[PDB]
Motif scaffolding. Sequence first.
Motif, short mmCIF file in Angstrom:
data_model
loop_
_atom_site.label_atom_id
_atom_site.label_comp_id
_atom_site.label_asym_id
_atom_site.label_seq_id
_atom_site.Cartn_x
_atom_site.Cartn_y
_atom_site.Cartn_z
N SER D 129 -15.76 11.66 57.41
CA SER D 129 -14.47 11.83 56.75
C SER D 129 -13.38 12.32 57.70
CB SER D 129 -14.60 12.80 55.58
OG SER D 129 -14.95 14.10 56.02
N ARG D 194 -18.10 19.35 62.71
CA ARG D 194 -19.37 20.06 62.67
C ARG D 194 -19.46 21.26 63.60
NH1 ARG D 194 -24.24 17.41 59.89
NH2 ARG D 194 -23.07 15.98 58.53
N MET D 218 -25.07 21.14 57.83
CA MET D 218 -25.23 20.51 56.53
C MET D 218 -24.75 21.38 55.39
SD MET D 218 -26.17 17.60 57.30
CE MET D 218 -27.18 16.47 58.25
N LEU D 219 -24.40 22.64 55.66
CA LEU D 219 -23.80 23.49 54.65
C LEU D 219 -22.37 23.05 54.39
CD1 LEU D 219 -25.09 26.86 56.11
CD2 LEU D 219 -25.63 26.09 53.81
N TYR D 258 -15.94 27.66 56.16
CA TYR D 258 -15.64 27.07 57.46
C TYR D 258 -14.45 27.75 58.11
CZ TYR D 258 -18.55 22.97 56.22
OH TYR D 258 -19.57 22.12 55.87
N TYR D 271 -11.72 19.09 59.46
CA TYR D 271 -12.93 18.61 58.82
C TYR D 271 -12.73 17.36 57.98
CZ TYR D 271 -14.07 23.47 59.93
OH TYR D 271 -14.24 24.67 60.57
N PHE D 273 -11.27 16.98 54.97
CA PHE D 273 -11.43 17.15 53.53
C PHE D 273 -10.45 18.21 53.07
CE2 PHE D 273 -13.40 21.19 52.32
CZ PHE D 273 -13.75 21.70 53.56
N1 LIG Z 1 -16.17 21.47 50.05
C1 LIG Z 1 -16.15 20.23 50.52
N2 LIG Z 1 -15.53 19.23 49.81
C2 LIG Z 1 -15.51 17.94 50.30
N3 LIG Z 1 -16.12 17.65 51.50
C3 LIG Z 1 -16.74 18.62 52.20
C4 LIG Z 1 -16.76 19.93 51.73
N4 LIG Z 1 -17.43 20.68 52.62
C5 LIG Z 1 -17.82 19.90 53.64
N5 LIG Z 1 -17.40 18.62 53.40
C6 LIG Z 1 -17.62 17.45 54.27
O1 LIG Z 1 -18.72 17.72 55.11
C7 LIG Z 1 -18.35 17.66 56.48
C8 LIG Z 1 -18.84 18.91 57.19
S1 LIG Z 1 -20.51 18.71 57.84
C9 LIG Z 1 -21.24 19.17 56.25
C10 LIG Z 1 -22.36 18.20 55.86
C11 LIG Z 1 -21.88 16.79 55.58
N6 LIG Z 1 -21.60 16.63 54.15
C12 LIG Z 1 -22.89 15.76 56.08
O2 LIG Z 1 -23.48 15.03 55.29
O3 LIG Z 1 -23.13 15.65 57.28
C13 LIG Z 1 -16.84 17.51 56.55
O4 LIG Z 1 -16.50 16.43 57.38
C14 LIG Z 1 -16.39 17.24 55.14
O5 LIG Z 1 -15.98 15.90 55.02
#
Ligand SMILES: Nc1ncnc2c1ncn2[C@@H]1O[C@H](CSCC[C@H](N)C(=O)O)[C@@H](O)[C@H]1O
Lengths: 130, 385, 40, 408
Positions: D129, D194, D218-219, D258, D271, D273
Motif C-alpha cells: 500500500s 516496515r 506483521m503487527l 507505529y 506506511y 494507510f
Molecule cells: N491500521 C491499519 N489500517 C490499514 N492498514 C494498515 C493498518 N496498519 C497497518 N496497515 C498496513 O500494513 C502495512 C504495515 S506492515 C503490517 C503487516 C501488513 N498488513 C502485511 O501484510 O505485511 C502498511 O503498509 C499498511 O498498509
Amino acid sequence: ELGAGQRPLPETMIALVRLSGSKGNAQRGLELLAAMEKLNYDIRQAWLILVEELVRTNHLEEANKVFLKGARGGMRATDQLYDLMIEEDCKAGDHSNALDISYEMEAAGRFATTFHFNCLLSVQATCGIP
Amino acid sequence: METYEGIIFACGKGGLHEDARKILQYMTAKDVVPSSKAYTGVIEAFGQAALYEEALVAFNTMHEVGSNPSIETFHSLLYSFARGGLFKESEVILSRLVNSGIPRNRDTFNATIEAYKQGGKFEEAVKTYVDMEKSRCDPDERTLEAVLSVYSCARLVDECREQFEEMKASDILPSIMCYCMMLSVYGKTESWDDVNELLEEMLSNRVSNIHQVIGQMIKGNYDDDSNWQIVEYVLDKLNSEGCGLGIRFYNALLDALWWLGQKERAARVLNEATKRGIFPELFRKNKLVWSVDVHRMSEGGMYTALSVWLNDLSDILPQLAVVVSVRGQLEKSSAARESPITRAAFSFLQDHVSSSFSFTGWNGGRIMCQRSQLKQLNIVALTNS
Amino acid sequence: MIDRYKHQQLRIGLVSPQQISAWATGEVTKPYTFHYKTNK
Amino acid sequence: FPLFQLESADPDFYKIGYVRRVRAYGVEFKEGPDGFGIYASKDIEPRRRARVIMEIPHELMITIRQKHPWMFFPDIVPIGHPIFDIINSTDPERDWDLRLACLLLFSFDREDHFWRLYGDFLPAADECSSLLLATEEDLAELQDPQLVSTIRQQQKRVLEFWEKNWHSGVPLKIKRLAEDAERFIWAVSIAQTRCISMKTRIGALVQDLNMMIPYADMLNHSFEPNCFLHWRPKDRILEVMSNAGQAIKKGEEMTINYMPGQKNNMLMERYGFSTPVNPWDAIPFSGDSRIHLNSFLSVFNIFGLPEEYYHDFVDGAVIAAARTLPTWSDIDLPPIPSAERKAVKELQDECRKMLAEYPTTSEQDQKLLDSLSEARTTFATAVKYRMHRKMFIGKIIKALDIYQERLL
Ligand SMILES: Nc1ncnc2c1ncn2[C@@H]1O[C@H](CSCC[C@H](N)C(=O)O)[C@@H](O)[C@H]1O
C-alpha cells in the motif's frame, strides 16, 4: 447539588479544588479530591491544580504535603510542576522536601538534570560539611 | 452555645431563615461546631418559608458535623412537610422513626393527619386517626382540630357537627380556627341557618376577645378605617407565636370568608397576612417567572390567592405564568396532576380565563401559561355577599 | 539517576581530661580486686 | 454430557521463524485480502505486568544505525563489497529508507540469510500500500495537493538513486540486486512501510537503529494499541509485550503504535494507510468562532492533559476534534449557552463548506470501494484516505450537535 440528587461535573469539582488552594485549605482540597475519585473522575488534573494554587498563595509547606501524597500515591506530575516544586523548596532552604520530590520524580520516570542538581547544591553548600 | 441556640430558636419560631443562615455561617467562620439543637432551629426556619431544599441540606449537615438529630428535629421536618402536604416525605420520616428506636408520640400523629389532609388523602387521614386510638395515646386539642379539618375539607356537615359539639362537651372553648372551619362546611353546603347560629355565638364571647373581633369582622361590622384598627390589633397579638400558628389561622379564616361569599374581604385579609410575613412563597414577579404558590393553602385561601394573582396579571411580560399546586417529590408522577389542589386550581382557571392555562408535560404539579398566550388574555369578580 | 546518598563518618582523637572524667561519672582509688572473706 | 452437545497463514510462515528461536505466545498469524495480521488465538488474561506475546531473535533482523557511520547489526555486508559504497553515498537524514532498501535487496541475494525465506511473505509490488508504488492516477484520487507533491518527490528521489547507482558499468553482484527500477522502488516501499526505529543496547553499545524485524512487521497500527515493542538487551531479543493489566479477547487483533502523534497524511506518506479515528488529525478553522474547551471535554468524558487526551460515539475523532477545534478557556469562567450556539452553528457551517470542496461524499467513496473489481492497492488506499477525512469532518459536525444540546 448533592442533596438534589445531581452528579457534579468534573469541572465543578475543579472549581472547588482550585478555590480551596487559593485560601490555603489543603484539608478541604484533599477531601474534594477524594470525592472526585469516589465519583470515578480523573483526579490527576485537579491534583496538579491544587498544588500550584498552594505554591502561588505562599503555602509551600501545605503544597509539599499535598504533592508528596499524590506522588507517593502513583500520580505523575508535569515537568513544569516538578521544576517548580524543587526550585521553590531550595529557595526556602528546604532540602528535605526537595530531595524527596526529586527521588519521586525519577521513580515516575523523569530523570534529574543539571538544573535540579543545582537547586539541591544551593542548599548543600551552606551546611558546613563539604 | 447558649446565645447561638437562643437566637436561632427565635429565627425558627418567626421563620427568619435569612438570619438563621447568617448565624450558622458566623458559627462556622469562628470554627464553632453548632449543636444538634442549633441546627434544628435552622431547619425550623426553612420549613416556615417552604424552603425544603435548604432545610434538608441542614438536616444532611447535622450528620456531617456529628450533631445527630434529636426527636425535636424529626418534628420540625414533619410539621414543615405537613403544611405542604408532602406525605411522601412524611412517610420517610415515619419509616425512619421506627428504625431509629423512636416511638410514635402524639405530635407525630398530628403531622401525619395534617400532611395527608393537605395532600388530599382523606381516606388515609382518618385511618391514621383510626389507628391512633388503637395505639392508646391521648389526642390533644390540635388533634381534634386536625381531624375536624379533614371532615370540613370533604364537606361532611353531620360529621363536623358531632366533632365540634364534642369539643365543647369537655369545656375546652375551641379556638377561632375550629370556628372558621364550621363556617366553611356550613358555607360550602349553603346552610345559612347554621352560619348565623354560630356567628351569634362568636358575637358575645365574653371570655375570648379573638372570637368576638374576628366574628364581628367577618360579618363586615369592622370594615371602616378606624374600625379596622381593632382587627389589626388582634392580628398583631396573634403575630407572636411565630409563622407556625399564623399560617393555620389565616388558612381557616380565608376558607371561611370565601365560602360565605365575603370574597372581597378575603382579599384584604390575605393582604394583611403577606405584609406580616405569612405565605412568603406566595408570589414571585420577575422577568422570567410570574408564579403563585398555593400548595400550603386551603381551598378558600387558594381561590383568594388565584383571584388576586389573576387580577394583578391583567394590570401588566414574563416568560411564563405558573401556578405551583404541588411542591415535592409527587411532582414527578401522575398522582400530582390528580391532586385535589391541582384539579381545583385548574377547574378554577378553566372558567375564568377560558383555556389559557394548560398543564406541563415535564411536571405534574404545575399549571403554566406561555408568554405568547399571555398576550391573548378585573378578570375575577371580588364582591361580598 | 540520583544516588542514594549515605554520609557516615567516624573519627579518632586525643581525649581531654574533662572527657575522661565525663566517661566515668567513678574514681578508682584502691588497689583491691576482690575481698578474701566475703568474695565480694 | 459432551456426547449430547481471515484465513490462517501458511503453516511454514511461523515454522521458519520457530526453528530459528522465534516464539509466539497466545497469538496466531492470519491472512486476509488486506494483508497479514496478528490475532490472539485465545483469551489473554490480564496480569500484574506486561505479558510476552512474541520473541524475535536479533539475528533474524536487518538493522542499520540511524546515525552516521553506517554499521549493520548483525554485520552481513562483507568488507569491500560495493553495496556499502552505495549505502555510504546516501543522505544521512533523508535516505534512511534507501539504506535499508539496499540492505534488503542484498539480504535477498544471500543464500543463508533468513529474509531469503521471509521475503516470500512480504507484499508484492501490486499488494503493498506504499504510495511510492502509486501511479499518477492513484495520486489523483488523494484530493490532497500537499501529500501528492510529497509523494512525487519521494518517487523522484528513489528513482534517481537507482539510476545513479545501478547504471551499466556496475558489477554483476550489484546488477542482480535491482535489475529494474520497479524492483528497487518495491524495496524502498518495503523499507518505509516496515521499518521499526528503536534505541537498543547491543553488548555495551547503545545506539539508535532502523530495523527490519520479521513477524513484528506483521503487527498492524493502532493509536490505542494493546501491545508495545521492548528490546531485551541481555539475549538480543525483541519482545512484543501486551499492555500490563489489559485483557485481550480471543480473535482480537494485536496492534502497536507505529507513529505516536502523527496525522493521517504522515501515515500515508510513510506506511501508505490512514485511519478515520486518528486522534491527531487537524482541520483548518478560521478561529472566528470558538467553543468552550472545558465543556466540550466534559460532555464527551475526555480527560487528561491536552497531549494525553483519552476517553473514559466518542472515539479518536472526537479527541482529534478537541485538539483541532477553535477553543477558549478562562480558568473557571462558564460559557453562555446562547453565545456557544452561535459558535457551534458557525463551526458547523465551516465544516460543511469543507465537505463541499470534495466532489464526492464519504458514503459515495465507501460504495465506490465496494464496487471495485480491478483496482490497484494504492487506488483504494487513496480513496480510503479522502473518505477518512470526510468521515472526520462529518464526525465533528455530529460532535458539535451533541455538545450544543448537552450544554443545557
Ligand atoms: N491500521 C491499519 N489500517 C490499514 N492498514 C494498515 C493498518 N496498519 C497497518 N496497515 C498496513 O500494513 C502495512 C504495515 S506492515 C503490517 C503487516 C501488513 N498488513 C502485511 O501484510 O505485511 C502498511 O503498509 C499498511 O498498509
